[PDB]
Amino acid sequence: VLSPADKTNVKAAWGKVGAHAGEYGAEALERMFLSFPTTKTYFPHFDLSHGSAQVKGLGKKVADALTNAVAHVDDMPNALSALSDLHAHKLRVDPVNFKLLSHCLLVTLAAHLPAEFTPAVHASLDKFLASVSTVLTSKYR
């Protein structure tokens, strides 16, 4: 469960990210593809090179989904339902991969939030991304 403090922390951090969200989403995907090459198995139709417009485009959508989740932190399952459907029944990304993108999102946030990424905020963001991952995989079976 996300505590009131977790929710406050997530909104603070994501708020500072602000208009950079899409850039950070693309950066997180790039970090994932490089650190965890098996994740590239889901993207044979993408050019995954640095600066790829396909990665930038996906990065913006991932970031917008997270913005929406933050905006609906008390009602996340409904906000993300269409995305839960899409991952469970079309994309069918093995659930293990969500922890890999979550880690890379954390790392991206850490690399861009010198002031905000305190230990407490790091903890809250990790819980938050784990919660989003759980929602995104909730309809897999």
């Binding site: 090459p37 098996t38 198995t41 889901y42 093995d94 991969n97 079976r141």
Partner: protein, 146 residues
């Protein structure tokens, strides 16, 4: 990883009792039922609408035979799984785009199938040996990913 001599002997002894085609069809079928996201590779295989449809699907059974046949042959090379499965690894990465986690799920299902098939003969130490084997094979199949 690594198997003791007694563990290798246990693995070989049990496997000599296995109907590879049947166990292969049963494991792949169960993989698609228990972990349905694994169906993503098999849209061309026809009816996967229910557990009975998956288990009875002739294309699912055919692929099960193919996969477990390769697994079976690999058991003759327990000391060189990476070498044995290198070319298949490259194929599964470069052309088939199979996330190696799938190999691990299949290993889990195979262990459950062996337990179901063999009952009490699938003792805790025999299971431990097979866990090393399925981990070794998954690791070997994953090794050439890039």
């Amino acid at each position: 990883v690594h198997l003791t001599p007694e563990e290798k002997s246990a693995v070989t002894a049990l496997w000599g009792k296995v109907n590879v085609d049947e166990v292969g069809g049963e494991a792949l079928g169960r993989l698609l039922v228990v972990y349905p996201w694994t169906q993503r590779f098999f849209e061309s295989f026809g009816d996967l609408s229910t557990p009975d449809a998956v288990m009875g699907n002739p294309k699912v059974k055919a692929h099960g035979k193919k996969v477990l046949g390769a697994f079976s042959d690999g058991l003759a090379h327990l000391d060189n799984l990476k070498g044995t499965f290198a070319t298949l690894s490259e194929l599964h990465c470069d052309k088939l785009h199979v996330d190696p986690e799938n190999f691990r799920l299949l290993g889990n299902v195979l262990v459950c199938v062996l337990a179901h098939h063999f009952g009490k003969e699938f003792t805790p130490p025999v299971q431990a040996a097979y866990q090393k084997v399925v981990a070794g094979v998954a690791n070997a199949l994953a090794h050439k990913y890039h």
